[PDB]
Design an enzyme around this catalytic site. Sequence first.
Site, PDB file in Angstrom:
ATOM      1  N   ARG B  69       0.814  -1.212   0.000  1.00 14.50           N
ATOM      2  CA  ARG B  69       0.000   0.000   0.000  1.00 14.50           C
ATOM      3  C   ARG B  69       0.850   1.265   0.000  1.00 14.50           C
ATOM      4  O   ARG B  69       0.499   2.253  -0.660  1.00 14.50           O
ATOM      5  CB  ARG B  69      -0.962  -0.014   1.194  1.00 14.50           C
ATOM      6  CG  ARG B  69      -2.052  -1.087   1.069  1.00 14.50           C
ATOM      7  CD  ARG B  69      -2.934  -1.159   2.301  1.00 14.50           C
ATOM      8  NE  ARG B  69      -3.687   0.072   2.537  1.00 14.50           N
ATOM      9  CZ  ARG B  69      -4.430   0.284   3.620  1.00 14.50           C
ATOM     10  NH1 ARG B  69      -4.511  -0.647   4.560  1.00 14.50           N
ATOM     11  NH2 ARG B  69      -5.080   1.425   3.774  1.00 14.50           N
ATOM     12  N   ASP B 107      -3.947   7.471   3.764  1.00 18.93           N
ATOM     13  CA  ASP B 107      -3.148   7.690   2.559  1.00 18.93           C
ATOM     14  C   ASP B 107      -2.447   9.051   2.484  1.00 18.93           C
ATOM     15  O   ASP B 107      -1.626   9.270   1.584  1.00 18.93           O
ATOM     16  CB  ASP B 107      -4.008   7.469   1.312  1.00 18.93           C
ATOM     17  CG  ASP B 107      -5.244   8.359   1.283  1.00 18.93           C
ATOM     18  OD1 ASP B 107      -5.165   9.548   1.658  1.00 18.93           O
ATOM     19  OD2 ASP B 107      -6.313   7.869   0.869  1.00 18.93           O
ATOM     20  N   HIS B 122      -7.003   7.408  12.051  1.00 22.31           N
ATOM     21  CA  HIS B 122      -6.534   6.027  11.993  1.00 22.31           C
ATOM     22  C   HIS B 122      -5.033   5.968  11.743  1.00 22.31           C
ATOM     23  O   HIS B 122      -4.490   4.895  11.478  1.00 22.31           O
ATOM     24  CB  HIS B 122      -7.285   5.255  10.913  1.00 22.31           C
ATOM     25  CG  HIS B 122      -8.722   5.013  11.236  1.00 22.31           C
ATOM     26  ND1 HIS B 122      -9.683   4.797  10.277  1.00 22.31           N
ATOM     27  CD2 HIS B 122      -9.369   4.961  12.433  1.00 22.31           C
ATOM     28  CE1 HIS B 122     -10.852   4.621  10.851  1.00 22.31           C
ATOM     29  NE2 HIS B 122     -10.693   4.713  12.162  1.00 22.31           N
ATOM     30  N   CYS B 171      13.702  -0.563  14.567  1.00 24.65           N
ATOM     31  CA  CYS B 171      13.912   0.783  15.080  1.00 24.65           C
ATOM     32  C   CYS B 171      15.388   1.182  15.043  1.00 24.65           C
ATOM     33  O   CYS B 171      16.264   0.377  15.371  1.00 24.65           O
ATOM     34  CB  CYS B 171      13.379   0.857  16.508  1.00 24.65           C
ATOM     35  SG  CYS B 171      13.522   2.453  17.306  1.00 24.65           S
ATOM     36  N   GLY B 213     -17.655   9.853   0.904  1.00 27.19           N
ATOM     37  CA  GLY B 213     -17.077   8.599   0.457  1.00 27.19           C
ATOM     38  C   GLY B 213     -16.724   7.622   1.564  1.00 27.19           C
ATOM     39  O   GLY B 213     -15.692   6.950   1.489  1.00 27.19           O
ATOM     40  N   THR B 214     -17.548   7.548   2.602  1.00 30.97           N
ATOM     41  CA  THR B 214     -17.313   6.544   3.641  1.00 30.97           C
ATOM     42  C   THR B 214     -18.491   5.595   3.824  1.00 30.97           C
ATOM     43  O   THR B 214     -19.648   6.015   3.801  1.00 30.97           O
ATOM     44  CB  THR B 214     -16.871   7.158   4.995  1.00 30.97           C
ATOM     45  OG1 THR B 214     -16.900   6.152   6.028  1.00 30.97           O
ATOM     46  CG2 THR B 214     -17.759   8.312   5.385  1.00 30.97           C
ATOM     47  N   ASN B 239     -21.755   9.966  -1.947  1.00 33.52           N
ATOM     48  CA  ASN B 239     -21.359   8.576  -2.132  1.00 33.52           C
ATOM     49  C   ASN B 239     -21.844   8.007  -3.455  1.00 33.52           C
ATOM     50  O   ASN B 239     -22.726   8.571  -4.100  1.00 33.52           O
ATOM     51  CB  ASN B 239     -21.916   7.728  -0.986  1.00 33.52           C
ATOM     52  CG  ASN B 239     -20.840   6.959  -0.247  1.00 33.52           C
ATOM     53  OD1 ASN B 239     -20.516   5.825  -0.602  1.00 33.52           O
ATOM     54  ND2 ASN B 239     -20.281   7.574   0.790  1.00 33.52           N
ATOM     55  N   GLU B 241     -23.437   5.427  -3.431  1.00 31.32           N
ATOM     56  CA  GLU B 241     -24.578   4.657  -2.932  1.00 31.32           C
ATOM     57  C   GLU B 241     -25.124   5.235  -1.622  1.00 31.32           C
ATOM     58  O   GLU B 241     -24.648   6.260  -1.134  1.00 31.32           O
ATOM     59  CB  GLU B 241     -24.168   3.204  -2.691  1.00 31.32           C
ATOM     60  CG  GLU B 241     -23.223   3.038  -1.505  1.00 31.32           C
ATOM     61  CD  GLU B 241     -22.691   1.625  -1.368  1.00 31.32           C
ATOM     62  OE1 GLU B 241     -23.202   0.726  -2.068  1.00 31.32           O
ATOM     63  OE2 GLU B 241     -21.758   1.418  -0.563  1.00 31.32           O
TER      64      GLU B 241
HETATM   65 ZN   LIG Z   1      12.817   1.239  19.202  1.00 32.12          ZN
END
Ligand SMILES: [Zn+2]
EC number: 2.3.1.-
Lengths: 7, 266
Positions: B69, B107, B122, B171, B213-214, B239, B241
Amino acid sequence: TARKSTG
Amino acid sequence: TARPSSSMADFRKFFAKAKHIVIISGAGVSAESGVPTFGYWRKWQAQDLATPLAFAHNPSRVWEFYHYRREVMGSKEPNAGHRAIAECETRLGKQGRRVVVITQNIDELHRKAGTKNLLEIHGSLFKTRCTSCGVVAENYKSPICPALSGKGAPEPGTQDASIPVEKLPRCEEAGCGGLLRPHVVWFGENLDPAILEEVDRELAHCDLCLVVGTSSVVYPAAMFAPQVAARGVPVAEFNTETTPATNRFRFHFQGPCGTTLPEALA
Ligand SMILES: [Zn+2]
């Protein structure tokens, strides 16, 4: 409520 | 009782008076940028991979998913919808009017379009969090680690890379060496409390809401617009829909957000 869920 | 309105003129009447506009966006607003929503990656959908259990028991598979992604996304550009949202914000800011984007998307396409008031609830495809030290860091490196080079192919039938955990992203902070994970909120995990308080602040005081758009099947994001709507504040749904939250809402504008938003936010 803060929990990411699909349900 | 009545079906939601399809009247652009009615919406635009509210839009001219609105001082505080909330725009809630989902995968649809970026699927118009050629962004693969999930919608299958190999045999799995996002909800099966975006989970701490998936990561605990097959972290290589999860990293392949997120690697794919990241690489696909980098070369994607903001679309008319993202742009309309950004320019709307900029223009209204000079009128002393506030526009804020609350996005379920990771994104960063809203960021690329120039959106300033952005709540990424998110997290981000391009951030890591160390499972040991907890440090959060920006990461746009391609590929994120050598072992993932050329991996993440999305076709069903593609074999798992099965990268040993030591060779997954690690890390580089103070010689930690801890296993990195995407800084993305997964199903089963809590959204950031600080981000949630800010979300609540905008919802509690807006006078216009757009849900864009959700699918509104991911919680608690799915409850955001109905909350605004339950104050009687008008809510407009853009949307391809209808949704489970649609009939709560004042408006439904069917079609690509790239067509409907530039018009609505003109
Ligand atoms: Zn670390």
